[PDB]
């Protein structure tokens, strides 16, 4: 993170369940997020 | 969980919900009222988002005798009405519960009142030619089967006759089921029309819904809405040919206008409601015949003052394929059916699918009727003597024809004592093809008042 | 099972192509909606007409902005939308995938197929927002563009590029003259070089979907679904399709002149989009004006309709000609949109209710449809044979007004009544029945030189039919002539009277008198 | 509570119509000039209410129900609250009884029946309270006979008339009689809108008591338009948004509520009945004033008259070309639809 | 027309039950290789062979 | 040619059961694959370290600015009075 | 210095200052656009002060991909337009650009487009007989000099010829040269009139202004007063008597109306702006003769709906003086001038 922005990051964590796992993060109005339903509700979608 | 009133003003109440219980747009909410005298539950639907977990909404009971801080819950769900076989031969209202018996149909599957118009890929001309017993309607604007049917005028015109005329002479013939649905009218109609269909066989083939005037206008709004479902039931899983006759149409549109001047919309031109034929249209595209179903609608709207260049009605318009309406100067001359030909149309009248004689009957009629209103006020000033032979003969002619056209019918037995006649379609046609030949001028003014048939013409003048 | 070996191999090469990328986007959340329009708040930076996305599936454009608010319409289904959802800023300036593959289909106005055939194939996507073609890369009009019907071309000529007026009363005919233009052309498609073919294209606004199937069976039957497509826009759909609907066939249309092909824009009606436009802009609280109308309403018109214009040999020589229609109620013309819309274009065509009462079936009014073009869009035998009938007309209904309780009149006089009486029940003709050049100019002449001066009035048109009919058995030199020199010969003249002559000799209605 | 009466420290009384969050809006109904800041306000626990009796015969009282020109009080058995609700369709029963009425026209081309609404327009200076007085005289020679089955109580509603014309009809009404049998209702000008405005109401229920008990009623609204321009006034006031010709958008409900309960019961609930003659003026005999047009969609019949029919020589001067009656000829007698049958069409010809 | 008509539904009455023909035995070897095809695409979803 | 059209239509309706089969098989076959086989807590944390990797191997952003414009400059004037007076307070002061 | 937008609706724009650097009214602003397929700078009026550092503006583009804190700029002057003797040998807008070719640029002066009538002492006090050569035109309706002459007319009845002859005649007898600014003109007809004017031999004499519909209303407002102010610096610099055309005035007061209800006012009066004379006179005031040099005008009005007491025309009546026919009868008689004598008349 602090490769990424120049400036420290802290860090607050919230345990969420929903996902089945993966990674996501916010910084403000950016967002990251790799998470198994996400991607699996997207390649759904696209199937046809 | 649940949330609290804040404000409450005339119709429209708002109400609080707490983090992560807001319901979605269109959920039913119960609230209670409680009094010595005035004890009910009162019946609320969601109608938009304020935010700040704030939902703005209207109620379909009055909201006289309520008090702040009062808990409102939620059902999570949308309105229903109880369907199926049962339902027929009763009276509900628009919450469906049943007005004849206070415990009867309770067990029926439900269904969602809010629905979807069907695809566009599924879309089916209709043209047939339905043929009723009246001279004018069979003659000038032929019906369709499966079609759209409307009427037109203002008000004290006769439309309401018209339509239990029609009915009575229709579903006597008829195998399908009716749906009949009253949106606007006095109670007094309602009640006649229930000893009527009583005092035959046919109330137990038929299904009665309606709501009055003095209802808010939350219950007004959605009666129409009700029966769609009702009908749109019956027809999608029976296969079977219905009938669906609808009182009015502009009170909802009124009762929309009433509502949104409180909800916070800015007005629009003539204090019309924005966004009013969106609904329209909307809810117009409910009704229509499929390929396989086929369902015939007939309709009866207001005008207001007798105004045409009103938006309701313009906008109206352009929904209907067979239009008939109605003219407040030939009611005034006397002729009670009071149908102006020089306006109405229909979409079927053409020889390609019509017999050539009937085109030519029709044009020369036409033609003849437009002459006459076109040398009207010089009549009027300069009188008949002033006018060549060519002119007297077709102004005599346009009298005969304008007496001709009246008829008597059974729903008249109440006024007036004469009883019913009816004529076929050849009939009509030949005696119209005979009048416009020239070769019945020799009978007098009276004559030709009141006819049902040519032997009827006959015996009176020999009755002169 | 080669279909399902071919089913199977597709999904396999989808399946083991599946691939996604880690990229960061800013996100924003919904406050509150309702009423079709929804505020969405947290995005930084977004260019004015963004095209949405929202997590359900459905789809939204931005219009208002604001220092901490954004104003957003909802196209698509819309009882989905509630709080908490979360945008995603996508892509940038919505455009229209346009192609050839369009041809004999009708597409939704965002680009789907909402027909039941299947899916259809993409060429190029290019923005609605494009600037018109400038001053110095137009040519003059001169191109007989033809209409098949006898008043229109008769009265008023229409050209490449020129922009033609209807406006019609309730219950007129505009339709059906529509109709008849569109399938005219059938015969032109059959030639080989695209020299005369045209590529035609038509837009419906806020109409019930039986008569889009109506028409486009009529069409279908006429033969000339091959080379035309349909946009359409039923009252079901919300405000947004009725408001883009004719800027999605404006830019179908234009790639197609672009290359070299000429086209034929119709709009079925423009009130519809002006209501539309209107609800939206009161919904979105702006300030409004005279008729509840906000005040750019007019230059909204002056975007779409000037598209079409003649383009220079420099760019290949395409064209584009538009028919816009209006609705005029109670015989009004005082009324704002009518009033904007005739003074942006040249041109007008009134279709007054009285005259298709009785009589005239295509019921064109003459004392006011004019056309600025002229006589440089006409063919010049036509031109010749016309004889300037316009004021021949006007002063028989000048006169004719008088004489109808005159029975003692001027010999030149009663012959010019009759003269002009006789034009005016020659000009009538049924519907579905278009008229190809050659027999409107044969009609017009005529009806010009007072050969048929001695038919009876009651049947003239039947004699007419017939005369062109056996002129079309037993000879064809004439038309050849016509056709190839585009001018009348005195030979070809002495013919045609003997014709007519020998014709007329033999022909009876009832107590008729062949006369010199 | 919603439309909960308050006290007030002067004697006056209030009525809450909108709660906001923080505030309540109330509107005055007596004397306003002693109202300051600072007052006490309490709640009375009870929605508006009207007593009721039957000793209110043959005397004048204001809206609220309290004498102003009469001698003594009231003796009222019970109170009951403005606001109800109307029977339904499955309460209710045809129309077959006729209701008499003195000029031969009325009868002869539209007739008036128990449980039947008849609204009567024109202009001014046309004749149009002689009707119903008239209407009034003639009850007296059935009310003769004590039989409950052929016994009319009437009322009279006057809104917004000078105090001398009502002398005048109570003097025309003692010299005729039927002062014994009828009670009069009396919002003069002078008084503030709420009175105005809650008059008919109270009419209404006073009505609807003995309609309840099986007696047959009469009602007759001498002015509609002073109500409606009250409403307006109360809530361009109230700060309420307005609507077309600066009407609040509801006002047609409003006369809605008022004439959907009269009607006429069934046989198991007795044999009451109920009638209305509303007026309703208007300028220039022109109907396109929305007004006329909202009030005539829910009536059963309507009497047009006109100044020029007036001047020419006809004294009822009504117009048969356009009055209609939608019972029919039911409600007359046999004998007379014998007799008389299809004579506006012969006028009309 | 009306009889080439006839004869064209007929026809289609025809390829109603020969697709529904078709269709029986396509779907009774749909399953085939469908785990394949499943187990591909979770290896592609979670990035490592499955 | 039109029924041949509807013969391209039937083959359309071959590919609509295609699509359903190919949904419910990918959805239920995927989703019990992925909530069945990797859902032991020992695979959880080797997923994060993939996803580190990611975060390793991304372009680098720039990032910058973290009510009124009268309102901002008075405060940030009493921000800095305060810096500039506040150079003596004690423990307690 | 730099200023960033805050609020973006319809064409108008807001825009924030910092404290020093507060523009006056009617200045200009330039802006930019990032996005590759829709390139282009934008231009803007300032024509309120919202207080609190805020300007709103109106924008002479169309608006589309604007985002918010982009940078705003000052240029520090009026709307400028460029004069020379370089001026009426080509074509172009209020802007200044040439249509045909971007060859032309600042060589030229350029003067503000905002100036003031002449004042009160220095006015003519005497009137001036105008000859011209036509007979007809002469004996029944002359013209005064420096006046304005309003002309009724449709097309194929002379209008065009007419026109060219007047151009020429005061070209060729008096010398000077005369200016065409056609306002809301469709394409094609600029087009046509552009091709004609070539052929004639008379380009070369005349300067050519064009206000194109698909532009917002600023450009439709301002092209008159551009036009107007390049024939006063004609007038005032060379000494040579100038002649001005305007197309229309209907469409003047349209969009007039239209900016007065954008920017969120109160309409009175039939739906038109409340201050419409104080526009219409400033504009008219810039025409009379002075200083022994002459500025004669022409114009063609449109009366709405065939009523002749509405307000527009009745304002437009105000500064009229000469006022001609043209008919189709007259035409069908077969003479050039096709003037009706019993429909025109004169003041003078
Ligand atoms: N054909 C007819 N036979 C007998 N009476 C008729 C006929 N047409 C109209 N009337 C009379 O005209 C009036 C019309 O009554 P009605 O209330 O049905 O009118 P309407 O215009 O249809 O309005 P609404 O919807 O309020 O009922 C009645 O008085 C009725 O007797
Ligand atoms: N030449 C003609 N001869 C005979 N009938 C005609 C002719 N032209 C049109 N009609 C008839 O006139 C009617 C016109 O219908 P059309 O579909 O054109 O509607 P329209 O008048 O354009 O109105 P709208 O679009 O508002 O429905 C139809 O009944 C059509 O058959
Ligand atoms: N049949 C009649 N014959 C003669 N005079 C009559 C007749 N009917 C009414 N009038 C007279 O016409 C006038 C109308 O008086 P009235 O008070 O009823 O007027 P109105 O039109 O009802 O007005 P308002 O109640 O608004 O004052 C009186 O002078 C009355 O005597
Ligand atoms: N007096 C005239 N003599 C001969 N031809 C004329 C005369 N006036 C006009 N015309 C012809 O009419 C056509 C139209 O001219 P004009 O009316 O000036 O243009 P517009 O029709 O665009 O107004 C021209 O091509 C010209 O040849
Ligand atoms: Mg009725
Ligand atoms: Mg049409
Ligand atoms: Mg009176």
């Given at each position: ?37 996400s ?10 | ?5 804040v ?78 076989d ?5 009276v ?113 083939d ?6 009055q ?13 009700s ?32 509502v ?25 595209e ?24 009103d ?44 017999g ?89 003014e ?19 | ?6 089913i ?6 989808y ?19 309702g ?15 963004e ?7 459905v ?11 954004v ?30 593959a ?23 996507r ?38 033609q ?7 007129t ?19 080989g ?69 000429h ?12 209501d ?21 309403v ?8 000037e ?26 013309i ?29 019921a ?12 440089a ?13 316009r004021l ?6 000048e ?30 003709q049924?519907?579905y ?33 017939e ?19 585009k001018?009348?010969?005195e ?26 | ?5 308050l ?31 600072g ?28 004498p ?46 128990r ?5 009567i ?65 009396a919002?003069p ?148 639809k ?12 | ?15 109603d ?34 | 040619?039109?029924?041949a ?80 007076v506040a ?7």
């Amino acid at each position: 993170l602090s490769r990424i922005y120049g400036r420290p990051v802290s860090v607050q964590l919230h345990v969420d369940p929903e996902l089945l796992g993966g990674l996501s993060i916010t910084v403000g109005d950016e967002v990251i997020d790799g998470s198994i339903a996400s991607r699996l509700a997207a390649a759904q979608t696209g199937l046809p | 969980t649940a949330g609290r009133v804040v404000r409450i003003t005339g119709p429209v109440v708002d109400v609080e919900f707490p983090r992560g219980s807001v319901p979605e747009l269109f959920n039913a909410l119960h609230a209670e009222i409680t009094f010595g005298a005035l004890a009910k539950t009162l019946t609320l639907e969601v109608a938009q988002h304020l935010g700040d977990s704030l939902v703005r909404c209207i109620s379909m009971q009055p909201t006289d005798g309520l008090v702040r801080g009062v808990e409102v819950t939620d059902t999570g769900a949308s309105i229903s009405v109880p369907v199926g076989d049962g339902v027929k031969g009763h009276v509900f209202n628009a919450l469906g519960d049943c007005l004849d018996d206070p415990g009867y149909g309770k067990d029926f599957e439900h269904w969602s009142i809010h629905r979807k118009p069907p695809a566009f890929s599924d879309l089916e001309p209709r043209t047939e030619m339905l043929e009723t017993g009246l001279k004018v309607v069979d003659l000038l604007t032929p019906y369709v089967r499966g079609g759209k049917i409307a009427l037109f005028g203002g008000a004290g015109v006769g439309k309401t006759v018209l339509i239990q005329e029609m009915i009575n002479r229709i579903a006597r013939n008829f195998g399908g089921t009716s749906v009949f649905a009253g949106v606007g009218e006095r109670t007094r109609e309602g009640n006649d029309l229930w000893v009527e269909l009583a005092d035959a066989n046919v109330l137990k083939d038929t299904a009665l819904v309606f709501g009055q005037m003095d209802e808010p206008p939350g219950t007004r709004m959605r009666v129409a809405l009700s029966a769609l479902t009702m009908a749109e039931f019956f027809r999608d899983e029976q296969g079977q040919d219905v009938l669906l006759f609808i009182d009015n149409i502009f009170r909802f549109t009124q009762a929309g206008s009433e509502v949104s001047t409180l909800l916070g919309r800015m007005p629009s031109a003539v204090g019309y409601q924005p966004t009013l034929a969106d609904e329209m249209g909307e809810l117009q595209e409910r009704i229509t015949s499929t390929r396989g179903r086929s369902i015939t609608s007939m309709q009866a709207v207001y005008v207001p003052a007798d105004d045409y260049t009103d938006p309701a009605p313009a906008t109206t318009f352009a929904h209907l394929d067979a239009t008939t309406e109605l003219s407040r100067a030939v009611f005034s001359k006397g002729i009670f059916p009071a149908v102006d030909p020089l306006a109405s149309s229909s979409t079927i009248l053409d020889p390609a699918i019509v017999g050539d004689e009937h085109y030519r009957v029709a044009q020369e009629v036409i033609r003849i009727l437009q002459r006459y209103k076109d040398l009207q006020d010089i009549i009027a000033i300069l009188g008949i003597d002033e006018l060549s032979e060519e002119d007297k003969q077709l102004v005599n002619r346009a009298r005969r024809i304008e007496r001709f056209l009246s008829q008597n019918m059974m729903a008249a037995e109440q006024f007036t004592g004469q009883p019913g006649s009816t004529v076929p379609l050849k009939e009509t046609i030949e005696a119209f093809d005979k009048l416009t030949k020239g070769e019945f001028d020799h009978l007098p003014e009276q004559a030709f008042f009141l006819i049902g048939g040519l032997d009827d013409l006959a015996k009176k003048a020999e009755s002169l | 099972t080669i279909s399902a070996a071919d089913i199977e191999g597709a999904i396999e090469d989808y399946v083991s192509s599946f691939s996604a990328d880690t990229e960061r986007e800013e996100i924003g959340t919904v406050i509150d909606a309702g009423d079709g329009i929804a505020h969405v708040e947290g995005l930084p930076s977004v260019m004015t007409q963004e095209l949405l996305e929202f997590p359900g599936g459905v789809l939204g454009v931005a219009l208002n902005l604001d220092e901490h608010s954004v104003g957003a319409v909802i196209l698509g289904e819309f009882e989905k939308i509630e709080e908490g959802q979360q945008v995603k800023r996508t892509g940038e300036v919505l455009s229209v995938p346009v192609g050839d593959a369009f041809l004999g289909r009708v597409v939704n106005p965002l680009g789907q197929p909402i027909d039941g055939q299947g899916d259809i194939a993409a060429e190029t996507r290019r923005a609605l927002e494009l600037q018109a073609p400038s001053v110095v890369q137009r040519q003059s009009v001169s191109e007989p563009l033809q209409t098949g019907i006898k008043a229109i071309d008769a009265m008023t000529p229409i050209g490449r590029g020129q922009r033609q007026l209807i406006i019609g009363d309730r219950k007129t005919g505009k339709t059906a003259v529509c109709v008849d233009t569109i399938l005219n052309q059938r015969e032109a498609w059959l030639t080989g070089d695209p020299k005369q073919q045209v590529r035609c294209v038509y837009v419906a606004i806020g109409q019930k979907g039986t008569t889009i199937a109506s028409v486009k069976r009529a069409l279908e039957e006429g033969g000339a679904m091959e080379y035309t497509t349909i946009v359409a826009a039923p009252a079901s759909d919300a405000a947004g399709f009725k408001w883009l609907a004719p800027y999605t066939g404006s830019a179908i249309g234009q790639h197609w002149m672009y290359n070299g092909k000429h086209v034929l824009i119709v709009f079925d009606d423009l009130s519809k989009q002006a209501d539309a436009y209107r609800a939206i802009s009161l919904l979105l609280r702006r300030p409004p004006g005279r008729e509840a109308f906000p005040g750019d309403v007019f230059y909204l018109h002056s975007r779409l309709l000037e598209r079409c214009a003649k383009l220079s040999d420099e760019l290949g020589g395409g064209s584009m000609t538009g028919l816009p229609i209006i609705e005029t109620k109670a015989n009004d013309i005082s009324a704002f949109i009518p009033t904007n819309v005739i003074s942006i274009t040249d041109g007008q065509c009134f279709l007054e209710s009285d005259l298709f009462n009785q009589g005239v079936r295509p019921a064109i009014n003459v004392g006011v449809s004019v056309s600025r073009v002229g006589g440089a869009a006409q063919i010049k035998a036509m031109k010749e044979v016309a004889g300037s009938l316009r004021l021949d007309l006007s002063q028989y209904r000048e006169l004719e007004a008088f004489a109808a309780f005159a029975s003692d009149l001027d010999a030149a006089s009663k012959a010019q009544l009759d003269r002009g009486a006789r034009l005016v029940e020659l000009l009538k003709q049924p519907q579905y029945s278009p008229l190809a050049v050659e027999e409107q100019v044969v009609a017009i002449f005529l009806g010009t030189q007072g050969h048929l001066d001695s038919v009876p009035v009651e049947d003239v048109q039947r004699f007419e039919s017939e005369l062109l009919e056996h002129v079309k058995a037993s000879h064809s030199d004439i038309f050849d002539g016509i056709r190839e020199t585009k001018k009348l010969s005195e030979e070809a003249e002495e013919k045609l009277v003997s014709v007519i002559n020998e014709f007329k000799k033999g022909f009876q209605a009832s107590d008729g008198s062949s006369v010199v | 509570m919603t439309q909960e009466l308050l006290e007030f420290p002067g004697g006056v009384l209030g009525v809450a119509l909108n709660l906001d969050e923080h505030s309540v809006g109330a509107v005055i109904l007596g004397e306003f000039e002693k109202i300051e800041e600072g007052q006490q306000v309490k709640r009375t626990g009870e929605v508006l209410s009207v007593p009721v009796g039957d000793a209110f015969l043959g005397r004048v009282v204001n809206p609220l129900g309290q004498p102003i020109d009469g001698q003594g009080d009231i003796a009222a058995e019970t109170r009951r609250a403005l606001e109800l609700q109307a029977p339904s369709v499955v309460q209710r029963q045809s129309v077959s009884e006729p209701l008499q009425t003195g000029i031969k026209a009325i009868d002869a081309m539209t007739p008036i029946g128990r449980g039947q609404r008849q609204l009567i327009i024109g202009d001014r200076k046309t004749g149009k309270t002689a009707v119903c007085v008239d209407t009034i005289l003639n009850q007296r020679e059935a009310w003769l006979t004590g039989d409950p089955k052929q016994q009319v109580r009437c009322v009279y509603v006057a809104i917004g008339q000078k105090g001398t014309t009502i002398a005048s009809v109570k003097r025309a009404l003692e010299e005729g009689g039927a002062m014994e049998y009828t009670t009069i209702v009396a919002a003069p000008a002078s008084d503030a809108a709420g009175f105005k405005w809650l008059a008919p109401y109270t009419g209404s229920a006073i009505g609807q008591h003995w309609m309840y008990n099986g007696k047959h009623v009469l009602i007759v609204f001498d002015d509609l338009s002073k109500q409606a321009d009250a409403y307006r006034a109360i809530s361009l006031l109230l700060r309420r948004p307005p609507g077309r010709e600066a009407f609040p958008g509801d006002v047609f409900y409003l006369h809605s509520r008022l004439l959907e309960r009269c009607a006429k019961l069934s046989d198991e609930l007795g044999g009451g009945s109920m009638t209305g003659l509303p007026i309703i003026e208007t300028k220039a005999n022109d109907i396109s004033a929305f007004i006329p047009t909202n009030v005539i969609s829910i009536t059963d019949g309507q009497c047009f008259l006109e100044s020029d029919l007036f001047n020419q020589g006809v004294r009822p001067a009504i117009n048969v070309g356009v009055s209609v009656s939608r019972v029919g000829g039911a409600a007359q007698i046999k004998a007379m639809k014998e007799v008389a049958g299809s004579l506006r069409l012969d006028l009309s010809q | 027309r009306a009889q080439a008509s006839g004869e064209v539904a007929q026809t289609l009455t025809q390829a109603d039950q020969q697709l529904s023909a078709q269709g029986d035995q396509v779907r009774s070897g749909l399953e085939s290789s469908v785990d394949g095809l499943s187990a591909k695409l979770a290896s592609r979803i979670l990035g490592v062979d499955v | 040619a039109q029924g041949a059209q509807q013969i391209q239509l039937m083959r359309q309706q071959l590919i609509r059961q295609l699509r359903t089969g190919l949904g419910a098989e990918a959805v239920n076959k995927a989703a019990e694959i992925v909530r069945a086989h990797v859902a032991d807590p020992q695979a959880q944390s080797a997923t994060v370290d993939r996803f580190l990797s990611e975060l390793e191997q991304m372009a680098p952003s720039s990032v910058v600015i973290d009510l009124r414009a009268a309102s901002r400059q008075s405060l940030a004037a009493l921000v800095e009075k305060f810096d500039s007076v506040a150079g003596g307070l004690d423990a307690d002061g």
